[PDB]
Ligand binder design. Structure first.
Ligand code: ATP
Ligand code: MG
Lengths: 333, 316
C-alpha cells in the first residue's frame, strides 16, 4: 500500500524558490537523440511493406477454406511496431497468430511455409528466408524481419500436453502481448510517451544496471512518468525523463512499494516483482547515481552523446569540483 | 498497518534519545522560573510611576518538543514594545536577578550579551542547563521591511532581533503544521540524532530538517506510522530534493522567497543525497536498524506542560 515519494504527485507542496532553470539544451539534446535512435525512411518502408504482405496472407488464410482456416482464429499486430517505439538498427515487427487448434511444433513450421510461399508466388523476384523458433517463426527480407508469435484460444490452454504442444509460458506471453498492445493504444498513445520509451530502451542498453528492466515495464514506466499526475496533463519530455530517474531512485520498484500495477493482469500484480531483490537493489542504485549525475549537468553523457558512460555508475567521477560516488549495493544474501 | 518491524525499531530508537524525567523536570522548573520572573520584571516596569515588555514566548527545542538526552540549551523570546536597547537589556538583567528570588531559591547565573541581544541564564546543576532569553520587537521587522523603499542611540543588533522574530514564527508554524502530524515530531527527534552522529547529515540539523519532515510526511495521502513516515523522508531525499537544481525547501516563515537549505554547498547536497539514497535501500531490504545506529531488536508530542505564566492560543 506504500506509495514511494514522487515530486510530481505533489508539486504544490514544494513551491519553487527561484524560477525553473533553463533546460533548453537538455530538451534539444533529448530530441536529437530520438532522431538518432528513430528508424530511417528506408527502414519504416521496409517493415511497413513486409508486415503488410504477411498480414494479408494471414487475413486470407483465416477466411480461406483450407488447412489453416480450421487452424487460425485471428491475428494481431503487437510490439514497438504497433506502438511506434521501434529503434533504428532493429527493424523487427511482431504479429500474434491465434490458432484454433492445439499449437504443435509441426503446425507452426507448416504455417510458416504456407505464408512464405504465398509471398514467393506473389513476388518471386524478392528474396525471403523463413525460419521457425520456439515461440513461432519469422520471415526476413534483406531489410526487415517479421516475427510471428504463435498462441491458441484460451479454452485450449487448459487442455495442453507438454509433450506435443508449445510450452504454456510462450502461449501466455503471446496472449499477453495482445493485451499490452490493446492497453497501450487506448492509454499510452501520446507523442512524448513514445519518444520517452525509445529513449528508455537506449538508457537500459547503455547502463547494465538497468538490464533487469523488461520492455513491458519500460512501457508502463514511460506512460507513468508522462501521464500519471494530478492535473492529468502530459509532462514535458525533459521533466518526464528526470522523473523517470527520480521515481526509480525513490524506490518505486523496491520492496514495500506498490510500484506499478499491471493493467493487463489480475487483480493487482506488481510488475517489478518479476525482478529479484538483488536486481531491484541494482535498478534503484543505478537510477540513484544517474539522478545525481543529472543534477550536475551530465545529460549528454547520460543520453549517450559522449561515448561510453556505463562507468559513471561504478566509478567515482567529479563534476565541476563535486566528487560523485556511485550508489553501492545494499541487499545481502 | 505496514512496516511493523520498522515501527518497532524507530520507536525503540525514539526512547533511547527521549530525555529522562529528571531532564524534563529540570527544564520545566527552570523554564517556569524564568517566566514567572520575567512576568514579574514586567509588572515592575509597568509599575514605574504608572506595556513595555509585551510577552514571553517559548521557541526552539522547548516550544517544539524536540528535547533529547543531553540537551542543555533552552530558549525564550522577550517581545518589546519598541526596539530593544542596551539600556533595557541591562534594566531587565538586573531586575531578573531580584524577581527570581520571589519564585525560587535556586541560584541562577545571569550573563547579558549586548552582542547577541540576549540574556543567558545558567542553573547550578551538573551539567548545567542554559536558557537564552532573546530580546526583540515587531518594530524591528516592520522597519527592515519598509526600508522596500519607504530614536535611541543604543538599539540592539537588528540581525539578531530579526532571527529571534524568525524563531518565533518557526515555533508557531511548528505547533500549527508539524505538531498535529502523526509521527512527524517522532521522526524529527530520531533524525535529529542521526544528524548528530552522522556529520554528512549535520547541515540539515534544525529548521531545515523540521520543514523536510513536515513536507514529506505531510504530502502523504494518509496518516503514517513512525516506520513508513521515516521511509518517506528518505525517499524524498533520495529523489534529489536538496540537489542544486532541485526546488529546494521553501521557507514558510519568510515574506521573500527563501530556501531553507540555500546554505548547503554543492558537495554537501551530494553527500546528503547519496547517503539518504543508501539508507532508503537499507530500509527497503530490512536493515533500517543500521540506519538508526542500533542493533536489530530481539501523547508523544508534549515534553513539558504549556506555560501557565503567559499563555498562547493552541492540525485539522
Ligand atoms: N519480459 C517481458 N515481460 C512482459 N512483456 C514482455 C516481455 N518481453 C516482451 N514482452 C511483450 O512482448 C511484446 C513484444 O516483445 P518485444 O521484445 O518485441 O517488445 P517490443 O515492444 O516489440 O520491443 P522491440 O522494439 O525491441 O521489439 C511486447 O508487446 C511486450 O509487451
Ligand atoms: Mg518487436
Amino acid at each position: 500500500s506504500h506509495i514511494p515519494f514522487d515530486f510530481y504527485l505533489c508539486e504544490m507542496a514544494f513551491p519553487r524558490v527561484k524560477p525553473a532553470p533553463d533546460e533548453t539544451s537538455f530538451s534539444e539534446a533529448l530530441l536529437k537523440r530520438n532522431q538518432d535512435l528513430a528508424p530511417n525512411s528506408a527502414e519504416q518502408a521496409s517493415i511497413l511493406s513486409l508486415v503488410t504482405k504477411i498480414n494479408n496472407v494471414i487475413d486470407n488464410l483465416i477466411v480461406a477454406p483450407g488447412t489453416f482456416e480450421v487452424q487460425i482464429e485471428e491475428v494481431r499486430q503487437v510490439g514497438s511496431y504497433k506502438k511506434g517505439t521501434m529503434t533504428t538498427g532493429h527493424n523487427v515487427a511482431d504479429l500474434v497468430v491465434i490458432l484454433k487448434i492445439l499449437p504443435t511444433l509441426e503446425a507452426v513450421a507448416a504455417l510458416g511455409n504456407k505464408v512464405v510461399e504465398s509471398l514467393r508466388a506473389q513476388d518471386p523476384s524478392e528474396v525471403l528466408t523463413m525460419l521457425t523458433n520456439e515461440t513461432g517463426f519469422e520471415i526476413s527480407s534483406s531489410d526487415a524481419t517479421v516475427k510471428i508469435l504463435i498462441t491458441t484460444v484460451p479454452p485450449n490452454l487448459r487442455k495442453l500436453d507438454p509433450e506435443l504442444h508449445l510450452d504454456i509460458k510462450v502461449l501466455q506471453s503471446a496472449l499477453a502481448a495482445i493485451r499490452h498492445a490493446r492497453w497501450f493504444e487506448e492509454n499510452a498513445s501520446q507523442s512524448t510517451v513514445k519518444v520517452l520509451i525509445r529513449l528508455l530502451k537506449d538508457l537500459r542498453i547503455r547502463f547494465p544496471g538497468f538490464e533487469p528492466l523488461t520492455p513491458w515495464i519500460l512501457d508502463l514506466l514511460g506512460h507513468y512518468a508522462v501521464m500519471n499526475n494530478p492535473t492529468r496533463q502530459p509532462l514535458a519530455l525533459n521533466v518526464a525523463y528526470r522523473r523517470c530517474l527520480q521515481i526509480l531512485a525513490a524506490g518505486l520498484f523496491l520492496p514495500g512499494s506498490v510500484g506499478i500495477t499491471d493493467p493487463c493482469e489480475s487483480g493487482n500484480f506488481r510488475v517489478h516483482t518479476v525482478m529479484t531483490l538483488e536486481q531491484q537493489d541494482m535498478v534503484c542504485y543505478t537510477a540513484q547515481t544517474l539522478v545525481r549525475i543529472l543534477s550536475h549537468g551530465g545529460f549528454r553523457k547520460i543520453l549517450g552523446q559522449e561515448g561510453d558512460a556505463s562507468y559513471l555508475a561504478s566509478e567515482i567521477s567529479t563534476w565541476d569540483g563535486v566528487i560523485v560516488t556511485p550508489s553501492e549495493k545494499a541487499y545481502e544474501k | 498497518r505496514i512496516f511493523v518491524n520498522d515501527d518497532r525499531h524507530v520507536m525503540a530508537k525514539h526512547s533511547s534519545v527521549y530525555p529522562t524525567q529528571e531532564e524534563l523536570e529540570a527544564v520545566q522548573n527552570m523554564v517556569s522560573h524564568t517566566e514567572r520572573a520575567l512576568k514579574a520584571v514586567s509588572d515592575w516596569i509597568d509599575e514605574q510611576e504608572k506595556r513595555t515588555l509585551r510577552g514571553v514566548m517559548r521557541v526552539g527545542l522547548v516550544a517544539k518538543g524536540l528535547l533529547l538526552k543531553g540537551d542543555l540549551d533552552l530558549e525564550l523570546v522577550l517581545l518589546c514594545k519598541e526596539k530593544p536597547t542596551t539600556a533595557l537589556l541591562d534594566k531587565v538583567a538586573d531586575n531578573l536577578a531580584i524577581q527570581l528570588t520571589t519564585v525560587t531559591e535556586d541560584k541562577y547565573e545571569i550573563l547579558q550579551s549586548v552582542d547577541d541581544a540576549a540574556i543567558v541564564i545558567k542553573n547550578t546543576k551538573e551539567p548545567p542547563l542554559s536558557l537564552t532569553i532573546h530580546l526583540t520587537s515587531p518594530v524591528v521587522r516592520e522597519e527592515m521591511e519598509k526600508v522596500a523603499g519607504e530614536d535611541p542611540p543604543d538599539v540592539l543588533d537588528r540581525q539578531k532581533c530579526l532571527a529571534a522574530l524568525a524563531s518565533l514564527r518557526h515555533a508557531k508554524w511548528f505547533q500549527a503544521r508539524a505538531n498535529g502530524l502523526k509521527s512527524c515530531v517522532i521522526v524529527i527527534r530520531v533524525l535529529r540524532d542521526l544528524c548528530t552522529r552522522v556529520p554528512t547529515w549535520g547541515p540539515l540539523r534544525g529548521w531545515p530538517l523540521e520543514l523536510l519532515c513536515e513536507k514529506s510526511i505531510g504530502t502523504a495521502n494518509r496518516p503514517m506510522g513512525a516506520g513508513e513516515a521515516l521511509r518517506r523522508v528518505l525517499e524524498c531525499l533520495a529523489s534529489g530534493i536538496v540537489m542544486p537544481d532541485g526546488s529546494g525547501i521553501y521557507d514558510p516563515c519568510e515574506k521573500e522567497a527563501t530556501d531553507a537549505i540555500g546554505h548547503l554547498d554543492r558537495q554537501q547536497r551530494e553527500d546528503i543525497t547519496q547517503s539518504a539514497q543508501h539508507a532508503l535501500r537499507l530500509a527497503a531490504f530490512g536493515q533500517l536498524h543500521k540506519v538508526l545506529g542500533m542493533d536489530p531488536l530481539p501523547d508523544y508530542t508534549v515534553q513539558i506542560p504549556p506555560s501557565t505564566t503567559y499563555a498562547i492560543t493552541p492540525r485539522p
